[PDB]
Design an enzyme around this catalytic site. Sequence first.
Site, mmCIF file in Angstrom:
data_model
loop_
_atom_site.group_PDB
_atom_site.id
_atom_site.type_symbol
_atom_site.label_atom_id
_atom_site.label_comp_id
_atom_site.label_asym_id
_atom_site.label_seq_id
_atom_site.Cartn_x
_atom_site.Cartn_y
_atom_site.Cartn_z
ATOM 1 N N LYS A 48 0.822 -1.214 0.000
ATOM 2 C CA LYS A 48 0.000 0.000 0.000
ATOM 3 C C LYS A 48 0.856 1.265 0.000
ATOM 4 O O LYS A 48 0.351 2.357 -0.244
ATOM 5 C CB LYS A 48 -0.925 0.000 1.216
ATOM 6 C CG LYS A 48 -1.879 -1.185 1.257
ATOM 7 C CD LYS A 48 -2.521 -1.318 2.629
ATOM 8 C CE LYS A 48 -1.463 -1.544 3.714
ATOM 9 N NZ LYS A 48 -0.785 -2.870 3.576
ATOM 10 N N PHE A 52 13.094 -5.361 2.099
ATOM 11 C CA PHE A 52 14.228 -6.088 2.654
ATOM 12 C C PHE A 52 13.765 -6.967 3.815
ATOM 13 O O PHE A 52 14.055 -8.168 3.832
ATOM 14 C CB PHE A 52 15.294 -5.070 3.084
ATOM 15 C CG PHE A 52 16.268 -5.571 4.109
ATOM 16 C CD1 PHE A 52 17.034 -6.696 3.872
ATOM 17 C CD2 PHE A 52 16.453 -4.864 5.297
ATOM 18 C CE1 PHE A 52 17.974 -7.109 4.803
ATOM 19 C CE2 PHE A 52 17.382 -5.265 6.221
ATOM 20 C CZ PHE A 52 18.150 -6.389 5.983
ATOM 21 N N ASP A 70 12.019 -12.096 6.338
ATOM 22 C CA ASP A 70 11.071 -12.596 7.364
ATOM 23 C C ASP A 70 10.205 -13.768 6.892
ATOM 24 O O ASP A 70 9.880 -14.667 7.685
ATOM 25 C CB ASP A 70 10.116 -11.480 7.834
ATOM 26 C CG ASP A 70 10.786 -10.482 8.742
ATOM 27 O OD1 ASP A 70 11.944 -10.731 9.145
ATOM 28 O OD2 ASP A 70 10.158 -9.441 9.047
ATOM 29 N N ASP A 112 10.032 -17.331 8.771
ATOM 30 C CA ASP A 112 8.751 -17.832 9.277
ATOM 31 C C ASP A 112 8.184 -18.964 8.431
ATOM 32 O O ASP A 112 7.089 -19.444 8.721
ATOM 33 C CB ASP A 112 7.673 -16.750 9.271
ATOM 34 C CG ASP A 112 8.102 -15.486 9.934
ATOM 35 O OD1 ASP A 112 9.202 -15.449 10.527
ATOM 36 O OD2 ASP A 112 7.319 -14.513 9.853
ATOM 37 N N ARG A 140 2.369 -13.715 0.569
ATOM 38 C CA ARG A 140 2.563 -12.374 1.080
ATOM 39 C C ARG A 140 1.854 -11.465 0.090
ATOM 40 O O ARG A 140 2.027 -11.600 -1.123
ATOM 41 C CB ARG A 140 4.069 -12.067 1.147
ATOM 42 C CG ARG A 140 4.462 -10.598 0.956
ATOM 43 C CD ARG A 140 4.504 -9.808 2.261
ATOM 44 N NE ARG A 140 5.194 -10.512 3.341
ATOM 45 C CZ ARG A 140 5.162 -10.120 4.613
ATOM 46 N NH1 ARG A 140 4.474 -9.032 4.939
ATOM 47 N NH2 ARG A 140 5.802 -10.807 5.556
ATOM 48 N N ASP A 171 11.469 -10.952 19.086
ATOM 49 C CA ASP A 171 10.303 -11.717 18.680
ATOM 50 C C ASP A 171 10.649 -13.195 18.491
ATOM 51 O O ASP A 171 9.886 -14.071 18.895
ATOM 52 C CB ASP A 171 9.720 -11.147 17.384
ATOM 53 C CG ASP A 171 8.269 -11.546 17.171
ATOM 54 O OD1 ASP A 171 7.554 -11.788 18.178
ATOM 55 O OD2 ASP A 171 7.841 -11.614 16.004
ATOM 56 N N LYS A 178 10.678 -3.931 16.598
ATOM 57 C CA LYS A 178 10.446 -4.640 15.354
ATOM 58 C C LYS A 178 9.591 -3.884 14.344
ATOM 59 O O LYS A 178 9.794 -4.022 13.133
ATOM 60 C CB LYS A 178 9.810 -6.005 15.629
ATOM 61 C CG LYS A 178 9.597 -6.846 14.366
ATOM 62 C CD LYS A 178 8.781 -8.095 14.646
ATOM 63 C CE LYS A 178 8.480 -8.863 13.363
ATOM 64 N NZ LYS A 178 7.651 -10.094 13.583
ATOM 65 N N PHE A 195 -1.132 0.913 16.419
ATOM 66 C CA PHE A 195 -1.271 0.296 15.110
ATOM 67 C C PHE A 195 -1.188 -1.241 15.206
ATOM 68 O O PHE A 195 -2.039 -1.948 14.676
ATOM 69 C CB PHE A 195 -0.183 0.803 14.164
ATOM 70 C CG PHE A 195 0.078 -0.122 13.029
ATOM 71 C CD1 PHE A 195 -0.710 -0.077 11.890
ATOM 72 C CD2 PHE A 195 1.061 -1.100 13.133
ATOM 73 C CE1 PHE A 195 -0.531 -0.985 10.881
ATOM 74 C CE2 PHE A 195 1.250 -2.017 12.127
ATOM 75 C CZ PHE A 195 0.452 -1.963 10.998
ATOM 76 N N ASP A 254 -3.986 -4.218 14.883
ATOM 77 C CA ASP A 254 -3.721 -5.214 13.850
ATOM 78 C C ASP A 254 -3.941 -6.626 14.409
ATOM 79 O O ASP A 254 -4.538 -7.479 13.754
ATOM 80 C CB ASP A 254 -2.280 -5.062 13.360
ATOM 81 C CG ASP A 254 -2.092 -5.541 11.933
ATOM 82 O OD1 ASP A 254 -2.981 -5.271 11.095
ATOM 83 O OD2 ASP A 254 -1.052 -6.181 11.647
ATOM 84 N N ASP A 255 -3.467 -6.864 15.627
ATOM 85 C CA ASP A 255 -3.671 -8.150 16.287
ATOM 86 C C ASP A 255 -5.159 -8.393 16.509
ATOM 87 O O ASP A 255 -5.685 -9.467 16.195
ATOM 88 C CB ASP A 255 -2.936 -8.185 17.633
ATOM 89 C CG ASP A 255 -1.425 -8.128 17.472
ATOM 90 O OD1 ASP A 255 -0.949 -8.263 16.323
ATOM 91 O OD2 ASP A 255 -0.711 -7.945 18.483
#
Lengths: 341, 341
Positions: free
Chosen positions: A49, A90, A95, A99, A104, A166, A192, A231, A235-236
Amino acid sequence: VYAQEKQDFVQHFSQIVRVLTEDEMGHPEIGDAIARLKEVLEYNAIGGKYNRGLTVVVAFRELVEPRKQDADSLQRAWTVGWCVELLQAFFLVADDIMDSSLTRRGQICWYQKPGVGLDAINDANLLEACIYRLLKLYCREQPYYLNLIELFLQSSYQTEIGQTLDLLTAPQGNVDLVRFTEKRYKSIVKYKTAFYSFYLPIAAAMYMAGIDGEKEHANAKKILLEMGEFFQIQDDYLDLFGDPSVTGKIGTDIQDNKCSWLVVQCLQRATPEQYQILKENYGQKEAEKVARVKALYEELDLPAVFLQYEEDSYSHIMALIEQYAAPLPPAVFLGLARKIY
Amino acid sequence: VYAQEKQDFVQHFSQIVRVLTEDEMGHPEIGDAIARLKEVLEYNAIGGKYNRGLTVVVAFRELVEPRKQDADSLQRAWTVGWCVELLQAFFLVADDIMDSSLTRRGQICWYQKPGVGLDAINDANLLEACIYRLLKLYCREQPYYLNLIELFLQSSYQTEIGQTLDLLTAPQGNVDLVRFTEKRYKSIVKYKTAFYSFYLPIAAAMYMAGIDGEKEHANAKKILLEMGEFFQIQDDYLDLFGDPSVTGKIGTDIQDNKCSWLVVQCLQRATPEQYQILKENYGQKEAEKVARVKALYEELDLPAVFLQYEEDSYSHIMALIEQYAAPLPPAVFLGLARKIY
């Protein structure tokens, strides 16, 4: 401010790519590498975005006098905005490997494409390299040059510290809700996510505006990190109790054993039997067990707790803005707040 | 010059670690991350020969007047030497993941240790981050500050371009000796290895000596890249026709389908039947097939070709030094040449 500006932003990307792949063609020897670079760039820096990158541009227009916003000053702001987006690219490429993500932004993760694989590790590092190539190419002679370099380096280091935190906190295969505490959550979010997503873009614009004051930056950082904390918390929340059609994505925090804000609150609001259930359904794959956690959150009125938190957070941020915005225009911060709330 | 200097070098590492893990303890929140950082540092930056890092220190002493080599100037040279070593550590950790190596410097690769795995990707990036933290911490106020930052960034980018080239050239699973040409070989060596292993250390010392002249640097680079080309070519040769007890390592270039110098020459010196054999034994695992390639090289008198190349190379380098060393002391380059020849 983002509505019509997003247009010239994505438009500038073709030039960024041209510059990053042209000032290398003087060595046809590395031609094939440069071609690979282009492909990495186009696949990974495009399709988001561009909130962070556009924030550099919007902020630049609000902090700089109009008669000083010549064609060149603007192209530089466009380039620094794309630098943030490259830092972003990057982190994501790297990531997604760590993970073991599959997708994505809806499409296949770069490292999952045929014939890429772990080579994506070098690709991610090239994306990071391009940032400083852009800065040199466009800002080498500007008074804020070294300031931006240091800013991007510090933002990378802080993001990487946060990622380490994390990683230590939710070891894949070490289900331990014990370390999922509020202090660890806020520390992870801050390093993070909040520093590079909210402070970096505004900070970049500031330096380009000649606002390099250590105090003013400390003031913006106070506001911005707090905005970044809300934020992520929102988001969670939305990941679970959100609407996949509106948001544009389906939640998986529970199937991923994330140190979510929800699970952090649920852990402070849970009887020994409430925890027993969480300690047995959190991190699973089955839709039957996942949905079992959602029910436990609901029963604990966490959706209510969030709404209560959202009101408190909004009040605090406005107080924060009233207290630390100046000498900056409060509109710089209010534009961001209006977006994330 | 390296003999007794290597002592104070490894000794300074404890301070480097202290500084990198102490100026963060003011935030006990990230304490656990910082502990992880220490472990990454101690495991990955230690255990090599420190040639590159020591080259910064040796070169610094030869380029700077003795009365200007105070305790502080020296500590800085020690720190910049360790920065090169951290860049080194950054590349190896990441490269061992990409190549799926098992061991490095004799021990288990960091990413292969239990509970590390692909998290090593973030670890590698922290090692890269530490470089710029050191530079800020020790050289923030020096006139060559921005010069060193840019030098390290450029060395990373060039190494990463080289790695891309190398990756495109020997795709694991795409045995194609066709792209194994001399021009591709020299291009890979130059970008992936020669720039950061030979130019960077001397270049760093130069800037710390106040030698920032674009011409002088272009002069040193001409000599140094050439030394780096011979370094790698001799490394490829020794990998096969070397003595594992002297060198301290066992060769595997043939079992790894590397774009070695040997295979590059063997490809220019081979009848269609000579190639048929190479195209069927190169990249295998069996000791029977590998030893089959070694025989084909030998038959082509490549060991002789190398010795012939080593004499030509040595003459050229000495001519290069006689022609481009000044204003620098030729001893700066002769020390390196004596080591690699």
